[PDB]
Design a protein around this ligand. Structure first.
Ligand SMILES: CC(C)[C@H](N)C(=O)O
Ligand SMILES: CC(C)[C@H](N)C(=O)O
Lengths: 155, 155
């Protein structure tokens, strides 16, 4: 589908949701639907504000992070070192959203890191991951739209 | 410039502005910059919440509307009859944003009507107008992004 269709999908969701008690789970599921990727909305200190999983993986440490709603400390800290969107980061990147013990299995795993920003403040990070299919401009548009509005709905 | 560049321009503006006292003038100027068109954010009852003019026109009734920050009653009412974005509406459309006494002069004037919606409620209308150049998907994406976030910043 065309980009305008996908943006319309986010827009209808935003239009109906404003105002109800903010729903990051819903935003993550929407982005997952239009970007076709795993979605994690991660706070400054690693708290999962929302996520939506597009691939079930059999890694226990990963399943725990989602049950805990908490990403690792070091990994989460290091996300501040990416000041601007950085896309198509491969399995060997320190920023990969796939678990490192499974690099062999997820050799084609791609990660996109999107700073969530609001008031000149890095409020969090929106992480996108999936297998094999390179992220393109359209995915970035949708990703950044979502990160911007999440940055707003965080306030 | 690519769409992703233009969306980045709106995004930086939104990112710095949240939160300061909402600024519809700034939003209108931004959209004008990226869509290259006149921009009017019109309330349910015709109040100009914001505008940004890309073409100065010599029509006094129009200059008054902007000084008053109020569009006409009938015209404003009839905007509810457009439930979804309707673009590239010509000079002879009842929805035209050009003054009707100057139809001859503005024969190539095109208008796009974008419902501003929030909570299942039509909150207003975002109107785009310009001469000669047809609106395309990219303009609509930018227009609808802006209308959606205006619908939110109205709440
Ligand atoms: C999955 C993510 C948090 C990181 N690459 C890790 O392996 O812990
Ligand atoms: C400009 C607008 C409000 C309308 N077409 C009019 O002529 O009054």
């Amino acid at each position: 589908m065309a980009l305008l269709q996908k943006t319309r999908i986010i827009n209808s969701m935003l239009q109906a949701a404003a105002g109800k008690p903010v729903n990051f789970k819903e935003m993550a599921e929407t982005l997952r639907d239009v970007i076709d990727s795993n979605i994690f909305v991660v706070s400054r200190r690693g708290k999962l504000l929302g996520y939506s999983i597009n691939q079930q993986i059999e890694n226990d440490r990963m399943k725990k992070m989602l049950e805990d709603r908490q990403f690792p400390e070091e990994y989460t800290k290091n996300l501040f070192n990416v000041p601007e969107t950085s896309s198509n980061l491969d399995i060997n990147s320190e920023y990969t959203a796939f678990p490192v013990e499974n690099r062999d299995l997820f050799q084609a795993g791609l990660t996109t890191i999107v700073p969530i920003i609001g008031g000149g403040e890095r409020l969090g990070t929106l992480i996108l991951s999936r297998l094999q299919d390179q992220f393109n401009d359209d995915d970035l548009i949708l990703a950044e739209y979502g990160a911007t509005v999440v940055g707003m709905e965080i306030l």
